[PDB]
Coordinates of C-alpha atoms in Angstrom, one line a residue:
Chain D
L11 CA 181.7 54.2 81.0
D12 CA 184.3 51.8 79.5
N13 CA 184.6 51.5 75.8
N14 CA 185.4 47.8 75.9
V15 CA 182.1 47.4 77.7
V16 CA 180.6 49.6 75.0
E17 CA 181.8 47.3 72.2
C18 CA 180.7 44.3 74.3
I19 CA 177.2 45.9 74.3
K20 CA 177.6 46.4 70.5
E21 CA 178.5 42.7 70.0
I22 CA 175.6 41.4 72.0
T23 CA 173.1 43.8 70.4
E24 CA 174.2 42.8 66.9
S25 CA 173.9 39.2 68.1
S26 CA 170.5 40.0 69.4
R27 CA 169.2 41.4 66.2
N28 CA 170.9 38.5 64.5
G29 CA 168.9 36.3 66.9
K30 CA 171.9 34.1 67.9
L31 CA 172.1 35.0 71.6
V32 CA 171.4 32.7 74.5
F33 CA 171.0 33.7 78.1
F34 CA 172.3 31.5 80.8
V35 CA 170.7 32.2 84.2
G36 CA 172.3 30.9 87.4
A37 CA 170.7 30.9 90.8
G38 CA 170.6 34.6 91.6
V39 CA 167.1 35.1 90.1
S40 CA 165.8 32.8 92.8
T41 CA 167.3 35.1 95.4
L42 CA 165.7 38.1 93.6
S43 CA 162.3 36.2 93.6
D44 CA 162.5 35.4 97.4
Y45 CA 162.6 31.7 96.6
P46 CA 163.8 29.4 99.3
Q47 CA 167.6 29.4 99.1
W48 CA 169.9 26.3 99.0
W49 CA 172.2 27.2 101.9
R50 CA 169.3 27.4 104.4
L51 CA 168.3 24.0 103.1
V52 CA 171.8 22.8 103.9
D53 CA 171.2 24.4 107.4
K54 CA 168.0 22.4 107.7
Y55 CA 170.0 19.2 106.7
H56 CA 172.6 20.1 109.3
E57 CA 170.1 20.5 112.1
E58 CA 168.2 17.3 111.3
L59 CA 171.4 15.2 110.8
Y60 CA 173.7 16.3 113.7
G61 CA 170.7 17.1 116.0
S62 CA 171.9 20.7 115.9
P63 CA 172.7 23.4 113.3
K64 CA 175.4 24.7 115.8
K65 CA 177.6 27.3 114.2
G66 CA 177.6 25.0 111.2
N67 CA 180.8 26.3 109.6
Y68 CA 179.1 25.8 106.3
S69 CA 181.8 25.5 103.7
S70 CA 182.2 24.2 100.1
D71 CA 182.9 20.7 101.6
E72 CA 179.7 21.0 103.6
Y73 CA 177.7 21.9 100.5
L74 CA 178.6 18.5 99.1
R75 CA 179.0 16.5 102.3
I76 CA 175.9 17.0 104.3
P77 CA 173.2 15.7 101.9
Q78 CA 175.3 12.6 101.3
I79 CA 175.2 12.0 105.1
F80 CA 171.5 12.6 104.9
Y81 CA 171.1 10.0 102.1
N82 CA 173.1 7.2 103.6
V83 CA 172.1 7.7 107.3
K84 CA 168.5 8.8 107.2
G85 CA 167.5 7.2 103.9
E86 CA 165.7 8.7 101.0
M87 CA 162.1 9.1 102.3
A88 CA 163.2 11.9 104.7
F89 CA 164.8 13.6 101.8
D90 CA 161.4 13.6 100.0
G91 CA 159.7 14.8 103.2
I92 CA 162.1 17.8 103.5
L93 CA 161.8 18.4 99.7
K94 CA 158.0 18.5 100.1
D95 CA 158.3 20.7 103.1
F96 CA 160.7 23.3 101.7
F97 CA 160.0 23.4 98.0
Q98 CA 156.2 23.5 97.8
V99 CA 155.7 27.3 98.1
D100 CA 154.9 29.5 95.2
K101 CA 155.4 33.2 94.4
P102 CA 155.0 35.5 91.4
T103 CA 158.0 36.3 89.3
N104 CA 160.1 39.5 89.0
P105 CA 160.5 42.0 86.2
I106 CA 164.0 40.6 85.8
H107 CA 162.6 37.5 84.0
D108 CA 160.6 39.8 81.6
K109 CA 163.6 41.9 80.7
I110 CA 165.7 38.8 80.3
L111 CA 163.2 37.4 77.8
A112 CA 162.8 40.8 76.1
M113 CA 166.1 40.4 74.2
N114 CA 164.5 37.5 72.3
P115 CA 166.8 34.6 73.0
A116 CA 166.8 31.8 70.5
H117 CA 167.2 29.3 73.4
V118 CA 167.5 29.8 77.2
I119 CA 169.5 27.6 79.5
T120 CA 168.9 27.6 83.2
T121 CA 170.3 26.2 86.5
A122 CA 167.5 26.8 89.0
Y123 CA 165.1 24.1 90.3
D124 CA 162.0 26.4 90.1
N125 CA 159.8 27.0 87.1
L126 CA 159.4 30.7 87.1
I127 CA 161.3 31.1 83.8
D128 CA 158.8 28.8 82.0
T129 CA 155.9 30.8 83.4
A130 CA 157.5 34.0 82.2
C131 CA 158.1 32.4 78.8
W132 CA 154.4 31.8 78.6
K133 CA 153.8 35.4 79.7
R134 CA 156.0 36.7 76.9
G135 CA 153.8 35.0 74.3
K136 CA 156.2 32.7 72.6
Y137 CA 156.5 29.0 73.2
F138 CA 159.7 27.2 74.1
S139 CA 160.3 23.5 74.1
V140 CA 161.1 22.5 77.7
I141 CA 164.1 20.1 77.8
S142 CA 164.6 18.9 81.3
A143 CA 165.2 15.2 80.9
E144 CA 166.9 13.0 78.3
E145 CA 163.5 11.8 77.1
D146 CA 162.4 15.4 76.4
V147 CA 164.9 15.8 73.4
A148 CA 162.9 13.1 71.5
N149 CA 159.7 15.1 71.7
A150 CA 161.3 18.5 71.1
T151 CA 158.8 20.4 69.0
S152 CA 159.9 24.0 68.7
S153 CA 163.3 25.1 67.4
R154 CA 163.4 27.4 70.5
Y155 CA 164.7 25.4 73.4
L156 CA 164.3 25.7 77.2
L157 CA 167.4 23.8 78.3
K158 CA 167.5 22.6 81.9
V159 CA 170.6 21.4 83.8
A160 CA 169.4 21.1 87.3
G161 CA 166.0 19.6 86.4
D162 CA 162.8 20.6 88.1
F163 CA 159.9 19.1 90.1
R164 CA 157.5 18.5 87.2
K165 CA 158.3 14.8 87.4
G166 CA 157.2 14.6 91.0
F167 CA 159.3 15.1 94.0
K168 CA 161.5 12.0 93.6
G169 CA 165.2 12.0 94.0
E170 CA 165.8 11.0 90.4
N171 CA 164.2 14.2 89.0
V172 CA 166.3 16.4 91.2
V173 CA 170.1 16.5 91.1
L174 CA 171.9 17.8 94.2
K175 CA 174.3 15.0 95.4
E176 CA 177.9 14.9 94.3
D177 CA 177.8 11.3 92.9
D178 CA 175.0 12.5 90.7
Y179 CA 177.5 15.0 89.3
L180 CA 180.0 12.1 89.0
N181 CA 177.4 10.1 87.0
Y182 CA 176.2 13.2 85.1
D183 CA 178.3 12.2 82.1
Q184 CA 176.2 9.1 81.6
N185 CA 173.0 10.4 83.2
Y186 CA 172.5 13.4 80.8
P187 CA 174.8 12.9 77.8
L188 CA 172.5 14.5 75.2
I189 CA 171.8 17.5 77.5
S190 CA 175.5 18.1 77.7
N191 CA 175.8 17.7 73.9
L192 CA 173.0 20.3 73.4
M193 CA 174.8 22.6 75.9
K194 CA 178.1 22.2 74.1
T195 CA 176.4 22.8 70.7
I196 CA 174.7 26.0 71.9
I197 CA 177.8 27.4 73.5
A198 CA 179.7 26.6 70.3
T199 CA 177.2 28.1 67.9
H200 CA 175.5 31.0 69.7
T201 CA 176.8 33.9 71.8
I202 CA 176.1 33.0 75.5
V203 CA 175.6 35.7 78.1
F204 CA 176.0 34.6 81.7
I205 CA 174.0 35.8 84.7
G206 CA 172.7 34.6 88.0
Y207 CA 175.8 33.3 89.8
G208 CA 178.6 34.4 92.0
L209 CA 181.6 32.7 90.3
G210 CA 181.0 29.5 92.3
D211 CA 179.5 27.1 89.7
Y212 CA 182.9 25.6 89.4
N213 CA 181.9 22.4 87.5
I214 CA 180.3 24.6 84.9
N215 CA 183.3 26.8 85.0
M216 CA 185.5 23.7 84.3
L217 CA 183.2 22.9 81.4
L218 CA 183.9 26.5 80.2
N219 CA 187.6 25.8 80.5
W220 CA 187.0 22.5 78.6
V221 CA 185.5 24.4 75.6
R222 CA 188.4 26.9 76.1
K223 CA 191.0 24.0 75.8
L224 CA 189.1 22.5 72.9
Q225 CA 188.6 25.7 70.8
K226 CA 191.2 28.5 71.9
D227 CA 190.4 32.0 70.5
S228 CA 188.0 30.6 67.9
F229 CA 185.6 30.2 70.8
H230 CA 183.9 33.5 71.4
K231 CA 184.5 35.0 74.8
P232 CA 181.3 34.8 76.8
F233 CA 180.0 37.7 78.9
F234 CA 179.1 37.7 82.6
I235 CA 177.7 40.6 84.6
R236 CA 179.3 40.6 88.1
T237 CA 176.7 41.4 90.7
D238 CA 178.9 41.5 93.7
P239 CA 178.7 45.0 95.1
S240 CA 182.4 45.2 96.1
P241 CA 185.0 46.5 93.6
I242 CA 186.4 43.8 91.3
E243 CA 190.0 42.7 91.5
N244 CA 191.3 43.8 88.2
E245 CA 194.0 41.2 88.2
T246 CA 191.3 38.5 88.6
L247 CA 189.5 40.3 85.7
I248 CA 192.6 40.0 83.5
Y249 CA 192.9 36.3 84.7
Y250 CA 189.3 35.7 83.6
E251 CA 190.3 37.3 80.3
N252 CA 193.2 34.8 80.2
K253 CA 190.4 32.3 81.0
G254 CA 188.5 34.0 78.2
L255 CA 185.7 35.7 80.1
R256 CA 184.3 39.2 79.5
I257 CA 183.0 40.3 82.9
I258 CA 181.1 43.6 83.4
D259 CA 180.7 44.8 86.9
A260 CA 177.5 46.2 88.2
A261 CA 179.3 48.4 90.7
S262 CA 181.2 50.0 87.8
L263 CA 177.8 51.4 86.8
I264 CA 176.3 52.2 90.2
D265 CA 176.8 50.8 93.7
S266 CA 174.6 51.0 96.9
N267 CA 174.0 48.5 99.8
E268 CA 174.4 44.8 98.9
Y269 CA 170.7 43.8 98.7
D270 CA 170.1 46.3 95.9
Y271 CA 171.7 43.9 93.5
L272 CA 168.2 43.2 92.2
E273 CA 168.0 46.8 91.2
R274 CA 171.5 46.4 89.8
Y275 CA 170.2 43.3 88.0
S276 CA 167.7 45.6 86.3
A277 CA 170.1 48.6 85.8
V278 CA 172.9 47.2 83.7
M279 CA 170.3 45.3 81.7
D280 CA 168.3 48.5 81.6
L281 CA 171.5 49.9 80.0
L282 CA 171.2 46.9 77.6
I283 CA 167.5 47.7 76.8
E284 CA 167.8 51.2 75.5
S285 CA 171.3 50.6 74.1
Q286 CA 171.3 52.6 70.8
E287 CA 174.2 52.8 68.4
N288 CA 173.6 56.5 67.7
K289 CA 173.5 57.2 71.5
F290 CA 177.3 56.8 71.7
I291 CA 178.1 58.4 68.3
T292 CA 179.3 61.8 69.5
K293 CA 181.6 63.2 66.7
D294 CA 180.9 64.1 63.1
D295 CA 183.4 61.8 61.5
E296 CA 181.7 58.9 63.4
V297 CA 178.4 60.2 61.9
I298 CA 179.6 60.2 58.3
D299 CA 181.4 56.8 58.8
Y300 CA 178.2 55.4 60.4
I301 CA 176.0 56.5 57.6
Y302 CA 178.5 55.2 55.0
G303 CA 178.4 51.8 56.7
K304 CA 174.6 52.1 56.8
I305 CA 173.9 53.3 53.2
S306 CA 176.9 52.7 50.8
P307 CA 176.1 49.0 50.3
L308 CA 173.0 50.4 48.5
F309 CA 175.1 51.7 45.6
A310 CA 174.1 48.8 43.3
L311 CA 170.6 50.0 42.5
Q312 CA 169.2 52.6 40.1
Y313 CA 166.3 54.2 41.9
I314 CA 164.7 53.7 45.3
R315 CA 161.5 55.3 46.6
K316 CA 161.8 57.8 49.4
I317 CA 159.1 56.0 51.4
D318 CA 161.3 52.9 51.6
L319 CA 164.0 55.0 53.4
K320 CA 162.1 54.7 56.8
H321 CA 163.0 51.0 56.7
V322 CA 166.7 51.9 56.9
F323 CA 166.7 54.2 59.9
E324 CA 164.4 52.3 62.3
Chain G
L17 CA 191.9 -2.7 120.1
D18 CA 188.5 -2.5 118.5
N19 CA 187.3 -5.5 116.5
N20 CA 187.5 -3.8 113.1
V21 CA 190.9 -2.4 114.2
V22 CA 191.9 -5.9 115.4
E23 CA 191.1 -7.6 112.1
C24 CA 192.7 -4.7 110.2
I25 CA 195.9 -5.1 112.2
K26 CA 195.7 -8.8 111.5
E27 CA 195.3 -8.0 107.8
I28 CA 198.3 -5.7 107.8
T29 CA 200.4 -8.2 109.9
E30 CA 199.7 -11.0 107.4
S31 CA 200.2 -8.9 104.3
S32 CA 203.5 -7.6 105.7
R33 CA 204.7 -10.9 107.1
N34 CA 204.9 -12.3 103.6
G35 CA 205.3 -8.8 102.2
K36 CA 202.5 -7.2 100.2
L37 CA 202.5 -3.6 101.4
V38 CA 202.8 0.0 100.1
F39 CA 202.7 3.0 102.5
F40 CA 201.2 6.1 100.9
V41 CA 202.5 9.2 102.5
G42 CA 200.4 12.4 102.6
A43 CA 201.7 15.7 103.9
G44 CA 201.8 15.7 107.7
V45 CA 204.7 13.2 107.6
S46 CA 206.7 16.1 106.3
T47 CA 205.5 18.2 109.2
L48 CA 206.7 15.5 111.6
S49 CA 210.2 16.5 110.7
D50 CA 208.9 20.1 110.7
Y51 CA 208.8 21.0 107.0
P52 CA 207.4 24.4 106.0
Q53 CA 203.7 24.6 105.3
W54 CA 202.2 25.2 101.9
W55 CA 199.3 27.4 103.0
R56 CA 201.9 29.7 104.6
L57 CA 203.3 30.2 101.1
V58 CA 199.7 30.8 99.9
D59 CA 199.5 33.5 102.6
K60 CA 202.8 34.9 101.3
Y61 CA 201.3 35.0 97.8
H62 CA 198.2 36.7 99.2
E63 CA 200.1 39.3 101.1
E64 CA 202.4 40.1 98.2
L65 CA 199.3 40.2 96.0
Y66 CA 197.4 42.2 98.6
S67 CA 188.8 28.7 100.0
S68 CA 190.3 25.8 98.1
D69 CA 189.9 27.7 94.9
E70 CA 191.8 30.7 96.3
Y71 CA 194.7 28.3 97.3
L72 CA 195.5 27.7 93.6
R73 CA 194.0 30.9 92.1
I74 CA 196.2 33.4 94.0
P75 CA 199.3 31.3 92.8
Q76 CA 197.7 31.4 89.3
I77 CA 197.4 35.2 89.0
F78 CA 200.7 35.5 90.9
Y79 CA 202.2 33.4 88.1
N80 CA 200.4 35.5 85.4
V81 CA 201.1 39.0 86.8
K82 CA 203.9 38.9 89.5
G83 CA 206.0 36.4 87.6
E84 CA 207.4 32.8 87.7
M85 CA 210.8 34.1 88.6
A86 CA 209.3 35.3 91.9
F87 CA 207.9 31.8 92.3
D88 CA 211.4 30.3 91.8
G89 CA 213.0 32.8 94.1
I90 CA 210.4 32.2 96.9
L91 CA 210.8 28.4 96.4
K92 CA 214.5 29.0 96.9
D93 CA 214.1 30.9 100.1
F94 CA 211.3 28.6 101.3
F95 CA 212.4 25.1 100.7
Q96 CA 216.3 25.1 100.8
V97 CA 216.4 24.4 104.6
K98 CA 215.7 18.7 107.3
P99 CA 216.5 15.4 109.0
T100 CA 214.3 12.3 109.2
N101 CA 212.0 10.9 111.8
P102 CA 211.4 7.5 113.5
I103 CA 208.0 7.6 111.7
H104 CA 209.9 7.2 108.4
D105 CA 212.1 4.5 110.1
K106 CA 209.0 2.5 111.2
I107 CA 207.5 2.9 107.8
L108 CA 210.5 1.6 106.0
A109 CA 211.1 -1.1 108.5
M110 CA 207.6 -2.4 107.8
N111 CA 207.9 -1.5 104.1
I112 CA 204.6 6.4 97.5
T113 CA 204.3 10.1 98.6
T114 CA 202.8 13.4 97.7
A115 CA 205.3 15.9 99.1
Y116 CA 208.3 17.4 97.4
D117 CA 211.2 17.1 99.8
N118 CA 213.7 14.3 99.6
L119 CA 213.6 13.3 103.2
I120 CA 211.9 10.0 102.4
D121 CA 214.7 9.4 99.9
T122 CA 217.3 10.0 102.5
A123 CA 215.5 7.7 104.9
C124 CA 215.3 5.0 102.2
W125 CA 219.0 5.2 101.3
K126 CA 219.8 5.2 105.1
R127 CA 218.4 1.7 104.9
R128 CA 212.5 -0.3 96.2
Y129 CA 210.5 1.9 94.0
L130 CA 210.2 5.3 95.6
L131 CA 207.5 7.2 93.8
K132 CA 207.0 10.9 94.5
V133 CA 203.7 11.4 92.7
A134 CA 203.8 15.2 92.6
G135 CA 207.3 15.7 91.3
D136 CA 210.4 17.0 93.1
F137 CA 213.1 19.6 93.0
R138 CA 215.8 17.1 92.2
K139 CA 216.6 18.7 88.8
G140 CA 216.0 22.2 90.4
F141 CA 213.5 24.7 91.8
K142 CA 211.3 25.2 88.8
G143 CA 207.6 25.4 88.2
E144 CA 207.4 22.4 85.9
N145 CA 209.2 20.2 88.5
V146 CA 206.3 20.1 91.0
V147 CA 202.5 20.5 90.9
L148 CA 201.1 23.4 92.9
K149 CA 199.1 25.3 90.4
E150 CA 195.4 25.2 89.3
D151 CA 196.2 24.5 85.6
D152 CA 198.9 22.1 86.9
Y153 CA 196.2 20.4 88.8
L154 CA 194.1 20.3 85.7
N155 CA 196.9 19.2 83.4
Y156 CA 198.3 16.6 85.8
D157 CA 196.8 13.5 84.1
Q158 CA 198.2 14.2 80.6
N159 CA 201.7 15.3 81.6
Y160 CA 202.9 12.2 83.6
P161 CA 200.6 9.3 82.7
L162 CA 203.2 6.7 83.7
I163 CA 202.7 7.8 87.3
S164 CA 199.0 7.3 87.1
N165 CA 199.6 3.9 85.5
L166 CA 202.1 2.8 88.2
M167 CA 199.7 4.1 90.9
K168 CA 196.7 2.2 89.6
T169 CA 198.9 -0.9 89.2
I170 CA 200.1 -0.6 92.8
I171 CA 196.5 -0.2 94.0
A172 CA 195.7 -3.8 93.1
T173 CA 199.3 -5.1 93.4
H174 CA 200.0 -4.4 97.1
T175 CA 198.1 -3.2 100.2
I176 CA 198.2 0.5 100.7
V177 CA 198.2 2.2 104.1
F178 CA 197.5 6.0 104.1
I179 CA 199.4 8.1 106.5
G180 CA 199.6 11.9 106.8
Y181 CA 196.9 12.5 104.2
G182 CA 195.6 15.9 105.0
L183 CA 192.7 15.6 102.5
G184 CA 193.9 18.6 100.5
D185 CA 193.9 16.7 97.1
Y186 CA 190.6 14.9 96.6
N187 CA 191.4 14.0 93.0
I188 CA 193.5 11.0 94.2
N189 CA 190.5 9.6 96.1
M190 CA 188.4 10.5 93.1
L191 CA 190.7 8.2 91.1
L192 CA 190.3 5.7 93.9
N193 CA 186.6 6.0 93.3
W194 CA 187.3 5.5 89.6
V195 CA 189.3 2.3 90.2
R196 CA 186.8 1.1 92.8
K197 CA 183.9 1.6 90.3
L198 CA 185.6 -1.2 88.4
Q199 CA 186.7 -3.1 91.5
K200 CA 183.3 -3.2 93.3
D201 CA 183.4 -6.2 95.7
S202 CA 187.1 -6.9 94.8
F203 CA 188.1 -3.9 96.9
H204 CA 191.2 -4.5 99.0
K205 CA 190.0 -1.6 101.2
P206 CA 193.1 0.5 102.2
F207 CA 193.5 2.0 105.6
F208 CA 193.8 5.7 106.6
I209 CA 194.7 6.8 110.1
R210 CA 192.2 9.6 110.8
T211 CA 194.5 11.5 113.2
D212 CA 192.3 14.6 113.6
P213 CA 192.4 16.3 117.1
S214 CA 188.8 15.5 117.9
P215 CA 187.4 12.0 118.0
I216 CA 185.5 11.3 114.8
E217 CA 181.8 11.8 114.9
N218 CA 179.6 8.8 114.3
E219 CA 178.1 9.9 111.0
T220 CA 181.5 10.8 109.6
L221 CA 182.8 7.3 110.4
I222 CA 179.6 5.9 109.1
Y223 CA 180.2 7.5 105.7
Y224 CA 183.9 6.5 105.7
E225 CA 182.8 2.9 106.5
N226 CA 180.1 3.0 103.8
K227 CA 182.5 4.3 101.1
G228 CA 184.7 1.2 101.6
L229 CA 188.0 2.7 102.9
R230 CA 188.5 1.1 106.4
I231 CA 189.4 3.7 109.0
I232 CA 191.5 3.8 112.1
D233 CA 191.5 6.8 114.4
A234 CA 194.0 7.5 117.2
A235 CA 191.7 9.9 118.9
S236 CA 189.1 7.1 119.1
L237 CA 191.6 4.8 120.7
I238 CA 193.0 7.2 123.4
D239 CA 192.9 11.0 124.1
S240 CA 194.8 12.5 121.3
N241 CA 194.9 16.0 120.0
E242 CA 196.9 17.4 117.0
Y243 CA 199.4 19.2 119.4
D244 CA 200.5 15.6 120.4
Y245 CA 200.5 14.6 116.7
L246 CA 203.7 12.6 116.8
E247 CA 202.8 10.3 119.7
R248 CA 199.4 9.7 118.0
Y249 CA 201.4 7.8 115.4
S250 CA 203.3 6.2 118.3
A251 CA 199.8 5.3 119.5
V252 CA 199.1 3.4 116.3
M253 CA 202.0 2.4 114.1
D254 CA 204.1 1.2 117.0
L255 CA 201.2 -1.2 117.6
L256 CA 201.6 -1.9 114.0
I257 CA 205.3 -2.3 114.6
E258 CA 204.8 -4.8 117.5
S259 CA 202.1 -6.6 115.5
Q260 CA 202.2 -10.1 116.9
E261 CA 200.0 -13.1 117.7
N262 CA 201.0 -12.6 121.4
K263 CA 198.5 -9.7 121.3
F264 CA 195.8 -12.1 120.2
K265 CA 192.3 -17.6 125.3
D266 CA 193.0 -21.3 125.5
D267 CA 191.1 -22.6 122.5
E268 CA 192.6 -20.0 120.1
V269 CA 196.1 -21.1 121.4
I270 CA 195.2 -24.7 120.6
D271 CA 193.9 -23.7 117.2
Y272 CA 197.1 -21.7 116.3
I273 CA 199.4 -24.5 117.5
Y274 CA 197.3 -26.9 115.4
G275 CA 197.5 -24.7 112.4
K276 CA 201.2 -24.3 112.8
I277 CA 201.9 -28.0 113.1
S278 CA 199.3 -29.6 110.9
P279 CA 201.0 -29.2 107.5
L280 CA 203.8 -31.3 108.9
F281 CA 201.4 -34.2 109.4
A282 CA 201.5 -34.9 105.7
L283 CA 205.3 -35.2 105.9
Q284 CA 207.7 -37.7 107.5
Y285 CA 209.8 -37.7 110.6
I286 CA 210.9 -34.1 111.2
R287 CA 214.2 -32.8 112.5
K288 CA 214.1 -31.7 116.1
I289 CA 216.6 -28.8 115.6
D290 CA 214.5 -27.8 112.6
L291 CA 211.5 -27.4 114.9
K292 CA 212.8 -24.0 116.0
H293 CA 211.7 -22.8 112.5
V294 CA 208.2 -23.9 113.3
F295 CA 208.0 -21.3 116.0
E296 CA 210.7 -19.0 114.5

């Protein structure tokens, strides 16, 4: 165990009992839930467009080249046909959504086209205002917000509800301004914990560098749990610290196979669930300093009942 | 001589006959005189340390950890070695760049606003002189805004012909998209020689047609692979060199002679020795 990770856990737990923490979930939880992945949808676009999926050589260019070719060559109705064909299936959610919501986020910001997180939000008991379009901010009832970058399919299976094309990201500044303003306000105000991606959401990472270049060290360094099973390049970790990122590797805790990342998705968060302050207090001077910091602001009274004391020590 | 290629050659010939023309130079024009390759230096940074994001990230952590003096030293041992090519000669005979060598400057003074848009080592081999870093890619707009202003002026001011652009920097064509957002139907539609070893697939040229940038490909014209790179340009720009109305029936001959003579109908008796100037 690493003590910087220990105080990162301390910081997010005091943020959690403060209630000022917000989980960002990327696209890894769709992979845990056996949702249809995006790269095989690119493979489907490649076989319909070129008349063959061939070797494909699917690169970062081909992520943002092939659906553009689909749009201009084959029109937009075949896009809706493939979207109906590939994104109509349903499946029950994972325990990962439950243990994500169990830390009581004030708001939750997502980048996955499904709606499993909303169903899990209804399963937890609380209600969150779903904010997926610019019109949704007007009828925003609850103070607890479900913020949605990628949209969903609740507005039908049209192309305007989805966002996957690159010129949509080019127009995204004028398409969803208030969503971006909400996102910037939440990342300015609340502690944001990052999950569900493989360091590839580079537009969002450039937005992270944008708030870095607009706030410097006054911006609190956000936390991401690396779920890649390989050992992490420590120089890249220090570079992310220079970028202002606090990354915690799953493989630093435990590592086996590559598909067991779902279990790793539990395990570190399991380490978050039963994270107790007195668990790591192992020396007697730490005990007396801990109880001083836990009691000594109650010097101002005159008498306090013993039965009140159970409120102090959980 | 495809019909779009014919009218593009006509457009370049007319715009260079009076003179309204800027040749943008990518990176393969440096390789025509055999300049060292940047991804080889990226491989050197990778090997001394041990995607497109890696190509600037390994220099970035190499700058943070290994040091900028190692960057200056490896630039000294990598880019202190070149002559010029007839490609440059044809370009300047017809008459901006992205590379960092001064070979285009030597070709220019062998024979006019030379703009190296990514800086140069003229004041020395330092990190601030050129742009090859991720943050330098991010901070490129604010540091030298005069270059962006001059470039966006030259976009509308003169015709641009793209050569040697290896598509590494997409931010320049992103800025082209930004200018063409304002331009819309007023696009002067520059030309890029595709020069990839395979002939271009139909959907690729369909997108390149639809985006507005008119496209010539040497591999479409004749069998041309990248191993024959140089004569591919001799396949195209020499045709741009010999651009002439001799290359372009009876009725069009009558029409061109009529268009050459008919302004003189409004004038008086014309000097017979001055009639050589009618046909040059």
